[PDB]
Amino acid sequence: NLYFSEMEKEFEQIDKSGSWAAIYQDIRHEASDFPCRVAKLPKNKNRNRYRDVSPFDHSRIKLHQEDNDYINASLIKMEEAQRSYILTQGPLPNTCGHFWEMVWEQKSRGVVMLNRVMEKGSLKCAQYWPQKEEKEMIFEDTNLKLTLISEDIKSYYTVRQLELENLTTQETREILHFHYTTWPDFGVPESPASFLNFLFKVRESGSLSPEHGPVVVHCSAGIGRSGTFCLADTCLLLMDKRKDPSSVDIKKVLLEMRKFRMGLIQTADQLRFSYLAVIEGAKFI
Numbered sequence: 608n609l610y611f612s613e614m615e616k617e618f619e620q621i622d623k624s625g626s627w628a629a630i631y632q633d634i635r636h637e638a639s640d641f642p643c644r645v646a647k648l649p650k651n652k653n654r655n656r657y658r659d660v661s662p663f664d665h666s667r668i669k670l671h672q673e674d675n676d677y678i679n680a681s682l683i684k685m686e687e688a689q690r691s692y693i694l695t696q697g698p699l700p701n702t703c704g705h706f707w708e709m710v711w712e713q714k715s716r717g718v719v720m721l722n723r724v725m726e727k728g729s730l731k732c733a734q735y736w737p738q739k740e741e742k743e744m745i746f747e748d749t750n751l752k753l754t755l756i757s758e759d760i761k762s763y764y765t766v767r768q769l770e771l772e773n774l775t776t777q778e779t780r781e782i783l784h785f786h787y788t789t790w791p792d793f794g795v796p797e798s799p800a801s802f803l804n805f806l807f808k809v810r811e812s813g814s815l816s817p818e819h820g821p822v823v824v825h826c827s828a829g830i831g832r833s834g835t836f837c838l839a840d841t842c843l844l845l846m847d848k849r850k851d852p853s854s855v856d857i858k859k860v861l862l863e864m865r866k867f868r869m870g871l872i873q874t875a876d877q878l879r880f881s882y883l884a885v886i887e888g889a890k891f892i
């Protein structure tokens with residue numbers, strides 16, 4: 608034991624001992640297991656990108672769809688932090704209408720995308736938003752229209768403004784799309800600093816406010832990178848809210864989060880990064 612924050616000491620002690628992979632295995636072994644029956648139904652086979660990544664039945668988002676209410680998406684509700692997120696897979700070509708249906712129904716203001724459509728030659732996500740202002744998208748199945756209004760491209764991420772219209776009612780909403788383009792699969796962001804700039808931009812937008820529905824967060828499978836993002840955010844929230852900042856047990860927060868969706872944080876290095884981002888981020892809270 609060393610005495611000279613509680614979070615920082617844990618980190619150094621873990622980093623010296625090199626037990627990230629071990630602690631990460633603890634989390635894996637200790638993680639909740641709940642059924643995903645609806646997800647495994649034969650008729651939902653083509654709504655899942657990966658057959659080993661499913662939403663738990665209890666926390667899955669249901670489409671207000673007359674036909675089939677299933678989407679591979681989970682509500683993560685963090686009670687003390689008072690923040691909610693929808694974590695979802697990268698939409699598939701046949702589930703883009705569902706994806707935007709969910710955004711609409713859940714009254715989300717932001718979408719946070721943590722992957723690229725193509726990574727190392729592999730398709731990770733459908734092109735679910737318009738890349739060009741002049742070519743808008745219509746989703747006929749769910750009766751939605753989607754138009755790129757503007758985009759602000761930076762080195763490590765892009766922010767877009769989209770206009771989502773419910774064609775039935777002709778209501779329109781502005782959705783903000785926060786796209787971190789330099790976070791490789793099973794990897795970590797280019798640096799904690801760039802990650803936190805991104806996070807603070809999402810926050811400053813008001814997208815994570817209780818005034819709106821839960822932000823929709825996705826990567827490819829909606830667990831590794833998305834898990835890292837949310838865990839960092841929630842931990843920083845708890846530090847601000849609590850009289851004791853150093854009381855925030857990152858491992859325990861992650862396990863709580865894992866009660867709502869499987870596999871959040873997919874490598875030991877992502878775990879390490881999340882600790883790192885929270886410590887560095889704590890300065891700015």
Ligand SMILES: [Cl-]
Nearest residue numbers: 685686687688
């Ligand atoms: Cl919480």
Ligand SMILES: [Cl-]
Nearest residue numbers: 699730732733
């Ligand atoms: Cl695809």
Ligand SMILES: [Mg+2]
Nearest residue numbers: 664665666667
């Ligand atoms: Mg419930």
Ligand SMILES: [Mg+2]
Nearest residue numbers: 738739740741
């Ligand atoms: Mg143009």
